[PDB]
Enzyme design. Sequence first.
Site, short mmCIF file in Angstrom:
data_model
loop_
_atom_site.label_atom_id
_atom_site.label_comp_id
_atom_site.label_asym_id
_atom_site.label_seq_id
_atom_site.Cartn_x
_atom_site.Cartn_y
_atom_site.Cartn_z
N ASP A 1 0.83 -1.18 0.00
CA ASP A 1 0.00 0.00 0.00
C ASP A 1 0.87 1.24 0.00
OD1 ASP A 1 -2.49 1.26 -0.12
OD2 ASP A 1 -2.79 1.24 2.04
N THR B 1 -4.17 1.55 -4.39
CA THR B 1 -4.36 2.46 -5.51
C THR B 1 -3.64 2.02 -6.78
OG1 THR B 1 -4.43 4.12 -3.79
CG2 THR B 1 -4.43 4.89 -6.06
N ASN C 1 0.07 7.63 2.33
CA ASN C 1 0.45 6.86 3.51
C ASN C 1 1.77 7.30 4.11
OD1 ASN C 1 -1.90 5.38 3.29
ND2 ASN C 1 -0.88 3.48 2.65
N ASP D 1 -0.97 3.96 8.38
CA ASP D 1 -2.06 3.16 7.83
C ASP D 1 -1.56 1.80 7.36
OD1 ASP D 1 -4.35 2.12 6.60
OD2 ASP D 1 -4.77 3.92 5.41
N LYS E 1 2.23 4.55 -1.19
CA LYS E 1 1.70 5.68 -1.97
C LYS E 1 1.89 6.96 -1.13
CE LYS E 1 -3.02 5.28 -0.27
NZ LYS E 1 -4.35 4.72 -0.52
#
Length: 332
Positions: A158, A193, A163, A176, A160
């Site tokens: 995750d 994403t 975060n 997160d 990105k």
Amino acid sequence: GSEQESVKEFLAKAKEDFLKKWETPSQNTAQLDQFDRIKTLGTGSFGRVMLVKHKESGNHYAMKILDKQKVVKLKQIEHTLNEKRILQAVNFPFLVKLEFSFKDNSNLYMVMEYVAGGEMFSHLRRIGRFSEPHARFYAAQIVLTFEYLHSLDLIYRDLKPENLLIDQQGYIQVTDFGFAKRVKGRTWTLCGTPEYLAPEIILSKGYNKAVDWWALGVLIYEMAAGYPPFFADQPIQIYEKIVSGKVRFPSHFSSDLKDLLRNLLQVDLTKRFGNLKNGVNDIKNHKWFATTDWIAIYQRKVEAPFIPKFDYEEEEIRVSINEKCGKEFTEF
């Protein structure tokens, strides 16, 4: 290099330090009436976030109150339990600290280390693009934490700009850990994403920890360029481009950056930097990072590229009489 084995040994204690906490995770390390509710940092989906002051130490934390019933209704009992289990066992300079964790009859609480910096996404839109030596600073921290995480068999999956938060010291703080998983081999769950999703994930085949290295590429690129390497308007076309594996570098990209990105952004899971024999080292050693002192980054010795700038309303705190959905969060 020389005594560069003290890394394979650092990674071994952190492990015996994680599993221990992983086997018997800490519960209720504090309670509501121990903190002084300062303000309401904002209301999320499960519940609100409140700036709090630990009565005793006089410290400032970010208490994420998340309604027990509402969580179950939103259908995320597991995702929540798992995020608390990881955060509680993990421990590394560029990861948000889960200081305290407790509960009651109506909701779960997670006291985090408070950071004023802000999301990388924001800083990116404001500044536009970053200096190669600036992105390098950030990438370094990402590289380190992934080395930490992966040592523990954890796939972040995750990565990105959203975060990634910035310290009042200028450093990174990955936040997160929702989609994080403890896996030895391969997994299949789709999430995250699209512009950072690696070919493997898109082509609904089996993927592994290498997904994080691909994303790191997309991230390093976006920071220096000012826009992601694979951007469309509609998802279907991003996927297309993310699978084609054809990257076009903006003219100012150094020869060194291009090389590093080409190795990281490689559709071939057998030629991708990070998923190889020399592992993380193909990345830490690469000429682009030649100017970076890995231990200095870890110790927070290096100078930050920049440091973000440092009639009272009210709110309620419904701590119900009898325990709602108590059987469901026994592990919390």
